[PDB]
Design a protein around this ligand. Structure first.
Ligand SMILES: [Cl-]
Length: 159
């Protein structure tokens, strides 16, 4: 299914691609457990697969957050614990959301563990500057895996 074919597909696409993908490479089963416990969230299967294989992934300056090289000592994005804790402190996302991408000002992308898509995983939501005021979310992808594949596909057509 989608989750069992996810890593093969991402690799197939990175292989075809001639852009450089920057991956921390530092995700491990132990660190995945530690991040989930710290944030208070279960990570969806495609996100944990991504964490284990890539850790983080940045390409064309498009950055998908995760387990950075410094791990618990990360002091900036693209570490997902850093980003998520920070956003919660500032009210831009809540305790059920895991921040995974920030495409310029006022556009935050999260795994929403409270909103399930059609593949048994949490969807990706986009939230903006007024989230702390109105809590509105926009669904922008059916799962973490599908979101990442969509953005890598876009890189294969657009400069
Ligand atoms: Cl890193």
């Amino acid at each position: 299914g989608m989750a069992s074919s996810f890593l093969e597909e991402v690799d197939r696409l990175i292989t075809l691609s001639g852009i450089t993908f920057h991956a921390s490479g530092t995700g491990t089963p132990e660190l995945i457990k530690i991040y989930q416990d710290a944030l208070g969230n279960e990570f969806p299967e495609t996100y944990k697969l991504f964490l284990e294989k890539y850790g983080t992934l940045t390409f064309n300056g498009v950055s998908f957050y995760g387990i950075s090289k410094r791990g618990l000592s990360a002091a900036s994005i693209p570490d997902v614990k850093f980003a998520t804790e920070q956003a919660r402190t500032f009210g831009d996302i809540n305790k059920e959301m895991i921040m995974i991408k920030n495409s310029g000002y006022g556009s935050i992308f999260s795994i929403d563990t409270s909103i399930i898509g059609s593949e048994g995983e949490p969807v990706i939501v986009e939230t903006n500057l007024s989230f702390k005021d109105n809590t509105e979310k926009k669904v922008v992808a059916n799962s973490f895996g599908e979101f990442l594949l969509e953005e890598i596909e876009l890189s294969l057509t657009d400069l």
